[PDB]
Design a binder for this molecule. Structure first.
Ligand SMILES: CC(=O)N[C@@H]1[C@@H](O)[C@H](O[C@@H]2O[C@H](CO)[C@@H](O)[C@H](O)[C@H]2NC(C)=O)[C@@H](CO)O[C@@H]1O
Ligand SMILES: [Cl-]
Ligand SMILES: [Cl-]
Ligand SMILES: [Cl-]
Ligand SMILES: [Cl-]
Ligand SMILES: [Cl-]
Ligand code: NA
Ligand code: NA
Length: 129
């Protein structure tokens, strides 16, 4: 599924991401925009052979099992394919674990490079939330 911006904002808000670990909702929407262009089916292969999955491009090196990232962890205890669902619950729940792990949203490269330090509230501007 390719979410609309506000649709995703609302979904993320419903799933408890607004101000989760102090990260306002716009951060999460911004991260999803730049990680996946709001596409739950986005996948991208990393240089190490892991793959990033889903709307928040959660990687299989650490967070999910895709059966083809040897030596990797599955800290969200999910098949990576679960992160491609139109239902963002698995991605959100895994993202909550990630963002809680001490590094905040810096885990999301696109967030660090494209959202951090920007007016992320713009990402939820106009949305009914
Ligand atoms: C939370 C999450 O999974 N974020 C992704 C990053 O992990 C990806 O960065 C890449 O991650 C792999 C596995 O840890 C690293 O081997 C690789 O160096 C790293 N790539 C960069 C440029 O840092 C990122 C890839 O775009 O996608 C999500 O942000
Ligand atoms: Cl868009
Ligand atoms: Cl915000
Ligand atoms: Cl694996
Ligand atoms: Cl959802
Ligand atoms: Cl933080
Ligand atoms: Na990415
Ligand atoms: Na893994």
């Amino acid at each position: 599924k390719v979410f609309g911006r506000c649709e995703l904002a609302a979904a993320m808000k419903r799933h408890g991401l607004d101000n989760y670990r102090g990260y306002s909702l716009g951060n999460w929407v911004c991260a999803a925009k730049f990680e996946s262009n709001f596409n739950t089916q986005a996948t991208n292969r990393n240089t190490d052979g892991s793959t990033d999955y889903g709307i928040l491009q959660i990687n299989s090196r650490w967070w999910c099992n895709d059966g083809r990232t040897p030596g990797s962890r599955n800290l969200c205890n999910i098949p990576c394919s679960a992160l491609l669902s139109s239902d963002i619950t698995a991605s959100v729940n895994c993202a909550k674990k990630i963002v809680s792990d001490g590094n905040g949203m810096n885990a999301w490269v696109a967030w660090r490079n494209r959202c951090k330090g920007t007016d992320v509230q713009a990402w939820i501007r106009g949305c009914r939330l």
